[PDB]
Ligand binder design. Structure first.
Ligand SMILES: C[C@]1(c2cc(NC(=O)c3cnc(OCF)cn3)ccc2F)N=C(N)SCC12CCS(=O)(=O)CC2
Length: 381
């Protein structure tokens, strides 16, 4: 407990292409890069020679593979992934020294699932059984790991981010104190499906948005390492933007930029960070009527876009509207060291030692604060 040097820096990626960890599957071990995803619950890997993929899982080569004789079909708005369920021996080379028999969805067809140019071939769904596909009988990887080893029921993420290569750490079964400054503050996991949390108050540059409790969590708030943006519910997004525009009145920008429909650029080394507000989410504390506050910088919500071939320091506004509730994606998580305390049904937040900041302002985790009716920020059908 406390120092996990072997796991420090085990996360890699490219800006906007997520964070991945090296894993091995089967015997002999087939190495794959796997996207760390706290927003889903399936261990799903490419199993066929899709042209975008560096490699893929080849079941024929593995003496420990076991077929479950069940397909799985996961559709969504932009496309789909489908696969054949099995189990096999799984390890994380830069994780604990254990091998687990876990479920593997072997991907055999997809549409707009894999990213062209990316270096990952699969997705580690780290959320709970209730949202595993096809159903909650399919035990998620982390449940198998805890059930089969002496690994504590906890993991933490330091997602580092650029300011294009990213990095960070996934501490399996513990916390590394060198990855954060100040103290951890815990928010309760409302229900064990996604990592669900309750946002209790929103401030832009210290100004309360003044909306009802309930809107911030309509229909859900989640902590999601598989989403880039801070995604806010429609009404919350509107009020936030009105406020951000107002705070950034010194320089004007087209209306499309705020909808992430176009980019905006400055001359190199001359970004006016200072003209942009801090954003504060207050989270339900551990104790009745107690809350804490996390604060992100423009360095977190203005993402550097290197990819633009039509221009030779451009940025994307990475706060966006949602119909699925609040999603605290990379925009949030790049500010903090995030502890998913599954054992104690809570998520810790602390200032990330690696978060990108300037000489003037820092990402912050502050408390305690007094907030009443925090249960009422929560949503029910
Ligand atoms: C499985 C999935 C997913 C995420 C990603 N992410 C990235 O690629 C990325 C990129 N950059 C990120 O941060 C910045 F690096 C962070 N995640 C890819 C495939 C997926 F299948 N996981 C998520 N947490 S939400 C989209 C989703 C779930 C909902 S759904 O089924 O409607 C579509 C797919």
């Amino acid at each position: 407990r406390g120092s996990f040097v072997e796991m420090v820096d085990n996360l890699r990626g490219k800006s906007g292409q997520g964070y991945y960890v090296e894993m091995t599957v089967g015997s002999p071990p087939q190495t794959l890069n796997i996207l760390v995803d706290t927003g889903s619950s399936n261990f799903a890997v490419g199993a066929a020679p899709h042209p975008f993929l560096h490699r893929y899982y080849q079941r024929q080569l593995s003496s420990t593979y076991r077929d479950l004789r069940k397909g799985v079909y996961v559709p969504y708005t932009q496309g789909k992934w489908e696969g054949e369920l099995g189990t096999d021996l799984v390890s994380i080379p830069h994780g604990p020294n254990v091998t687990v028999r876990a479920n593997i969805a072997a991907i055999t067809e997809s549409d707009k699932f894999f990213i062209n140019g990316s270096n990952w071939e699969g997705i580690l769904g780290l959320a709970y059984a209730e949202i595993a596909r096809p159903d909650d009988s399919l035990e998620p990887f982390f449940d198998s790991l805890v059930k089969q080893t002496h690994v504590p029921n906890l993991f933490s993420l330091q997602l580092c981010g650029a300011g294009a290569s990213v990095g960070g750490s996934m501490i399996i079964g513990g916390i590394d104190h060198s990855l954060y400054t100040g103290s951890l503050w815990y928010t309760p996991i409302r229900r064990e499906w996604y990592y669900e949390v309750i946002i209790v108050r929103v401030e832009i540059n210290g100004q309360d948005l003044k909306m009802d409790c309930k809107e911030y969590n309509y229909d859900k708030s989640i902590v999601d390492s598989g989403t880039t943006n801070l995604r806010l519910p429609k009404k919350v997004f509107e009020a936030a933007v009105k406020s951000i525009k107002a705070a950034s009145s010194t320089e004007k920008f087209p209306d499309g930029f705020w909808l992430g429909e176009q980019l905006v650029c400055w001359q190199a080394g001359t970004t006016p960070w200072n003209i942009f507000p801090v954003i504060s989410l207050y989270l339900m504390g551990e104790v009745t009527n107690q809350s804490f506050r996390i604060t992100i910088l423009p360095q977190q919500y203005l993402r550097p876009v290197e990819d633009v071939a039509t221009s030779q320091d451009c940025y994307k506004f990475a706060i966006s509207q949602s119909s699925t509730g609040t999603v605290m994606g990379a925009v949030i998580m790049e500010g903090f060291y995030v502890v998913f305390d599954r054992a104690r049904k809570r998520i810790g937040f602390a200032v990330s030692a690696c978060h990108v900041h300037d000489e003037f302002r820092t990402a912050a985790v502050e408390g305690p604060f007094v907030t009443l009716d925090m249960e009422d920020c929560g949503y029910n059908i």
